[PDB]
Symmetry: D2
């Protein structure tokens, strides 16, 4: 494709017993996603446990993923940090590795004015040296609450080519689409994907795509063909899985599923994240069984 | 068709005269106007009818008149909720006396009540509804009451509860609710996400904007049913352009002003502390009324 | 002078949820005898929002008959509706109250301008009685800024502010901006800290059963006796800890019942009854308080 | 001795190149000591730790120890979102001879209370004996703890204090009540006096860097039952805080320290922007006021 629209998986970062990067597992996961027919990969975001990794660690993941999939699927590098300098450094690396775009979550923890938020994005676009920027809006985790006018301004900053809208507000989703007819708009909450597209999103970036991305591709197609029932059924099945992931723990639940699919060696997350309660293993293992059979 | 509450129903506004008193003629005109645009039914005495700046007798008067005007023609849901359980019980008995098809009550507000107290409140009202199904009313934005999914499941399964008015933009919960209750009558409460709400699981809706463009929402239901996503989306977008304006002008007064220009409501005022519409917005409101009448 | 320690009055009901006049009169006399500076009537504590307008007027009238000319009387005439609030303000004037008060209109969103016109209209109907601006975001849902609060307390006819907020930075900012303002601390559980921050008095639910403790804190801080001020606040907080567990208004009514002041300790539905498991503690608290004073 | 007292949350001075300005850092430390401060809280929010690398944080910790170890108490905030990164800093703090360590509840990602407790246990382990100062700050962390959870944290093996950055003075009293011997630091400077009255027996604050003596005075005044004096000092502190909120908190403090000839270049790291020039007159005059008053 010659654009950034599509269904992109937010890549997980496989670790070993020592909580260190499991390269072999990382490669298998990238290849697994490609096999599922995913349009691209969102790397180094929240889902990649980037915020509990160092700059060089995130950089190492970007390089491996590029090697594995550059030129086969689109690659978006989340380079955001609270620090502008650190974010710029990762932006330069992503450019160097040949990614198709960069992305950054609104800097968090410290309260920054909207003007400071804009300058932060501008500085990163600068270090991105040509790669388009995907503004990343996720108030739930960032705590940064933006008005519609602020979102419009951000999406219109020179160099911005897309918005990752991780919000359950579908009134605002529709308002954004109405204001920007050509904007690449990613639905950020998997559990409302179907309704998100109907409201105006023309794609999505999600962590659960890793184990059932074909289902989301299926909803996009179903909607395009006017098959509401199929779209709803697919969304219902995705939410049944989401209910479980919320019970078991999101990232660790996903890594465990990927473990039973023979993709990830050690399904651990980094501390403070704890391990999956062994009582959930049966359901998680059984889920992997279904997903593989469903393929 | 005889008793099912599924459908698209307008949350009725309450027209007042220049003295802030009930304008009976306009109330009757508004009921017929809604009936003429093919609305499935009316939700009476809710937040939209300004029930919370009305006395019990005033709410009963509206209930009775609406009943005389539309009983038998369309479905009628009486919102009898008050903070007080006893007052709610009184309105409930009157709703049954006037011949309404169902009753509804907002989660009692202001004072913090435990979940068990909310359940007993609903049970008491259901008792006084003597047969009329109860429509649970979830609206955290205004009530300040945030229910968990489990609590919502407990409420909708209480004996005598036949529907839920989900006034929430959380479409994940909407789907979870539909998944847990495959037969439940589930009303989308936020007009601005109607199309998406139906897709998530809602099987109908109740809203303030239905008063001036209810046929658009019916069109959306029709479009989705026929797999015409483009039409559904186009209709939702037009509804949202209107909603964009109402939010700027004031919701209830903006709607009344439009109805006024559509020759339905004589005086478009809401009761104080609600102020009047800022004159700078009249041109858009008049243009909208003109646009809607040509469309209808 | 409206400065002082005033009890937010509870409204006693009978077994059938109707007003219990005899207990209402008893409660008013009980407060007077324990030396309260005045009473705040018809507020949240009085269960005003589960009462009709005539019921609220009935309570105001009886209280005036019992306390007028003996202690200060503030009538909370607030309703969502301005017109209803105006009716109560005019009745308060007729009964001879010293002042009126109104919570910021709730449930429906209102612009700040609309809130100001709401207060103006009530002040007018109050026919001369000073207005006590009532700020309680936790329950009302209306969160005002310092600037807005400044505008409200400077409206003509406004004579005090009931600051029911735990933000003591803002309490200090209000005192700094208004040196002569009658500023009532609204959260009993931080009374001592509220005074240090700037409040020059208070209005509270718990004053009905231990008002002398708060009078004791005003006295202790005035004499520079921080040690005593803290002990008293701490004891007040051991009580508040319990009330939060039992249910606030019904817990206070149960205590007053065991003190033979209130005949029936019930609040109106949807408020439920007190869980029998808390009765031993409530009975023990009543005995302790009666022996203390 | 113990950890009770008035501890200034140390700012991190940078040069024109956004890099650590050791000269100004050392000067700020000594400046604080001369004010009569009881200790320093190093590497916290106020020190822009979350826009510094681990190595940069360690460097800061080491220089301060060299300047103050054995002169005043030293607490090292070593908290990061990552447990392992927090432990690295804890081990370093032990190495440089700090009196205690501290960690803000890990943020951004939603962690269960159990994971939070285990997070503190791990850091405490790596602290190798140094007491832990639990850090409660919902406003910035987004983590909301109940009183029961707070009681559990302060009773964890190895915890010796609680940094209470909350305006809830009812909860402050409840904490003191439940833990009569607990070191309790008031976290919001603008309510310092009231926090002490509610139960706090000291505090940690950013504004202490430019007027720590006023806070010590409040302690003295309350201790001597002088209410009006405590109030006037708090009012003076809040007039300052009102201005800092307008100019930007950290940069406003650095700017004041600049006119006091302590910090060479008063800039914070990006995304933080510079101070609006229209405020310089007020900030400069405030510096003068404080210098004379001192």
């Amino acid at each position: 494709a010659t654009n950034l629209r599509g269904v992109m998986a937010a890549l997980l970062t496989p670790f070993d017993q020592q909580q260190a990067l499991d390269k072999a597992s990382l490669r298998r996961l990238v290849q697994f996603n490609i096999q599922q027919g995913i349009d691209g990969l969102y790397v180094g975001g929240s889902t990649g446990e980037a915020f509990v990794q160092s700059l060089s660690e995130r950089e190492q993941v970007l390089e491996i993923v590029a090697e594995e999939a550059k030129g086969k699927i689109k690659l978006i590098a989340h380079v955001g940090c609270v620090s502008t300098a650190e974010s710029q450094q990762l932006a330069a690396s992503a450019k160097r590795y040949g990614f198709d775009a960069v992305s950054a979550v609104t800097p968090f923890y410290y309260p920054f004015s909207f003007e400071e938020h804009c300058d932060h994005y501008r500085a990163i676009i600068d270090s991105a040296d040509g790669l388009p920027m995907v503004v990343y809006n996720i108030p739930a985790l960032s705590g940064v609450k933006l008005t519609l006018d602020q979102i419009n301004t951000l999406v219109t900053l020179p160099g911005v080519g897309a918005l990752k809208q991780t919000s359950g507000d579908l009134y605002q989703m529709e308002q954004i689409r109405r204001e920007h007819p050509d904007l690449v708009l990613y639905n950020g909450y998997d559990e409302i994907f179907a309704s998100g597209l109907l409201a105006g999103a023309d794609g999505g970036i999600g962590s659960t795509y890793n184990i059932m991305g074909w289902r989301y591709q299926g909803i996009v197609k179903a909607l395009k063909e006017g098959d509401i029932q199929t779209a709803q059924k697919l969304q219902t099945e995705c939410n049944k899985v989401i209910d479980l992931l919320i019970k078991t723990g999101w990232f660790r639940g996903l890594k465990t599923v990927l473990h039973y699919m023979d993709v990830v060696s050690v399904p651990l997350c980094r501390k403070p994240f704890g391990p999956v309660d062994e009582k959930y293993l049966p359901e998680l293992k059984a889920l992997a069984q279904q997903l593989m059979q469903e393929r």
